[PDB]
Design a protein around this ligand. Structure first.
Ligand SMILES: [Mg+2]
Ligand SMILES: [Mg+2]
Lengths: 156, 157
């Protein structure tokens, strides 16, 4: 069991993914919603043993919940648009197939990559690839994913 | 927002979907985990002043939380198995394409339904279809969904 359980999130919040490359502003808005949700259910931040200024960390995090407020019409307007500015049509399977195809054919072989990504057209793949190679650093576990593809691309 | 905020769930809980038809026992086990999570974070059930005898309901719910316990070894083993007894490889796009293909070609045209479900072969479609028609009654917006399908099969005549 976690020394500190993961803090709760709004049950009906959108399941946006890192590989969909939405803009960072979207997550700032999502974090506002998460903090407000925590305020509404009376969530209290547990103090963390290690960290020295634990009392300071805990207080900092609680204050963020304490001062949380709903998203106003402006912000709500902004979020709606932001949710269209990502690769909403790319799911986990598309991503995994994209990664395996790159390892197999090399990031250059767009024709073969698209052929192996079942839910996507060459057009969709060229567009996604351009963004992927531009901000894949934002992803998590990429250092391992980049070496994995580099091993296969170089192994060819 | 809701009058009463939705109660918290473990952020790390498996994301099982209704259209994946997992055994109902699995959700009974996931509920035990949700209750233990709520106990674990100190969550308090709010009193819904609009239920009549809301005091009793509140106390009943809070007791379920207060008496919550983690899953034992047996249940942990049962859960791991149940997590493989659903259509784990069927995602939301597969499901949406399946539904639209049934409306577009009729439920018996496996050849065309499979062609339109990009990530599934005809064999996988038959297996899913066999369960779907057995308990699609468990799905959220089924009446509407089924009416539309019965309509597509109607236009086809
Ligand atoms: Mg393709
Ligand atoms: Mg198919």
């Amino acid at each position: 069991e976690p020394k500190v359980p993961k803090a709760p999130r709004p049950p009906k919040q959108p399941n946006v993914q890192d590989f969909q490359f939405f803009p960072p502003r979207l997550f700032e808005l999502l974090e506002k919603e998460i903090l407000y949700y925590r305020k509404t259910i009376g969530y209290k931040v547990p103090r963390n043993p290690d960290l020295p200024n634990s009392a300071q960390v805990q207080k900092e995090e609680q204050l963020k919940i304490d001062e949380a407020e709903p998203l106003n019409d402006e912000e709500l307007e902004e979020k709606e648009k932001l949710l269209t500015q990502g690769f909403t049509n790319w799911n986990k399977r598309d991503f995994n197939q994209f990664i395996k195809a790159n390892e197999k054919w090399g990031r250059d072989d767009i024709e073969n990559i698209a052929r192996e990504v079942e839910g996507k057209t060459p057009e969709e793949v060229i567009e996604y690839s351009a963004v992927f190679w531009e901000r894949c650093n934002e992803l998590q576990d990429i250092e391992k994913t980049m070496a994995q593809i580099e091993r296969g691309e170089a192994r060819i």
